[PDB]
């Protein structure tokens, strides 16, 4: 059986370069391909970038328990979520699976698939994360204040996760995740 790992973290502790490292380091890693009810953009491939389905199908899948998690996107412009079947079929074939989702999606997946390992990718310190949120200072005080507030709420509940990987350095955070996946 392949391990299923669910990778989450703060709304912006930066996860896309970590994900890219992982897919580079594990040759046959299955990166979960989400279902969505929005339209393809040019260059998006059905089955690779998303499984493109229609609102009616999506509701059918919700009703039959075929989603590990789903959410309304942009206040309900459309819907996205993680399909259960590809994840289970890949693991049964022996391929390792990575699901990358926001904290609400990680929380939902632990209920629908308890044997998934949940990983919270933590910053090496508060000041490290705060520096990154202030960034180039091109946002207003109110926006920055909201980001810092959001970040502390999210940080406060990393305890709910099976594992905390501290992102001290790309290579060792990536190494820790490889060890979990294979
Ligand atoms: N809950 C959930 N949200 C997703 C999923 N896939 C993408 N999203 C959310 O919707 C996305 C919008 O990205 P886009 O539509 O530009 O690919 C991101 O904000 C992402 O957090 C998913 O599988 N489940």
CA 137, CA 141: separation in Å to the nearest integer?
9
Atom of ligand 1 nearest to the CA of 32: 23
Residues contacting 153, CB < 8 A, separation 6+:
none
105 C-alpha to center of ligand 1: Å?
10
Q: Which residues of 118-155 are buried (b: 16+ CB within 10 A; e: fewer)?
A: bbbbbbeeeeebeeebeeeeeeeeeebeebeeebeebb
Short-list 2, 26, 3, 4, CA closest to 99: 4
Task: HSE, CB side, 13 Å, CA atoms: give it for residue 26.
Answer: 24
Residues 73 and 86 both lie in one domain: yes
What SS3 class is residue 89? helix
Residues 179 and 100 both lie in one domain: yes
- Report the chain's terminal Cα–Cα distance, integer Å: 10
7 C-alpha to center of ligand 1: Å?
14
Residues contacting 23, CB < 8 A, separation 6+:
29, 31, 98
What strands, in cross-sheet order, belong to the sheet with 35-36?
51-52, 35-36, 78-83, 67-73
Determine phi and psi for 8, rounding to 5 degrees.
Answer: -140, -175
Q: Which structure tokens are listed for 114?
A: 């308890």
80 C-alpha to center of ligand 1: Å?
6
- The DSSP call for residue 51 is E
Q: How many CB atoms lie within 10 A of CB 18?
A: 19
Q: Which structure tokens are listed for 168?
A: 């001290």
Beta strands 97-100 and 4-8 are parallel
- The resolution in Å comes to 2.3
Short-list 126, 154, 178, CA closest to 8: 154
Q: Whose CA is nearest to atom 7 of ligand 1?
A: 80
Q: Whose CA is nearest to atom 15 of ligand 1?
A: 38
Domain count, the chain: 2
Residue where a domain terminates, one of 65, 95, 125: 95
Q: What CATH code is carried by the domain that includes residue 121?
A: 3.40.50.300
Q: Which structure tokens are listed for 23?
A: 């897919």
Q: Which residues of 31-48 are buried (b: 16+ CB within 10 A; e: fewer)?
A: ebbbbbbeeeeeeeeeee
H-run or E-run covering 92? helix 84-93
| Residues of the domain holding 147 | 1-32+96-182
CA 115, CA 166: separation in Å to the nearest integer?
22
Q: Are 67 and 35 in contact (CB under 8 A)?
A: yes
């Amino acid at each position: 059986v392949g391990r299923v790992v669910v990778l989450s973290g703060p709304s912006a502790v930066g996860k896309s370069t970590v994900v890219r490292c992982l897919r580079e380091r594990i040759p046959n890693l299955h990166f979960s391909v989400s279902a969505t009810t929005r339209a393809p953009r040019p260059g998006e491939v059905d089955g690779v970038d998303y499984h493109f389905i229609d609102p009616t199908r999506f509701q059918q899948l919700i009703d039959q328990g075929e989603l590990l998690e789903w959410a309304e996107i942009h206040g309900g412009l459309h819907r996205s979520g993680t399909l259960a079947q590809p994840v289970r079929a890949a693991a049964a074939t022996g391929v390792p699976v990575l699901i990358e989702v926001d904290l609400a999606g990680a929380r939902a997946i632990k209920k629908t698939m308890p044997e998934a390992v949940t990983v919270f990718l933590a910053p090496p310190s508060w000041q490290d994360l705060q520096a990154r949120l202030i960034g180039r200072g091109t946002e207003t005080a109110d926006v920055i204040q909201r980001r810092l507030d959001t970040a502390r709420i999210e940080l406060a509940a990393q305890g709910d996760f099976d594992k905390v990987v501290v992102n001290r350095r790309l290579e060792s955070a990536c190494a820790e995740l490889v060890s979990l996946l294979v």
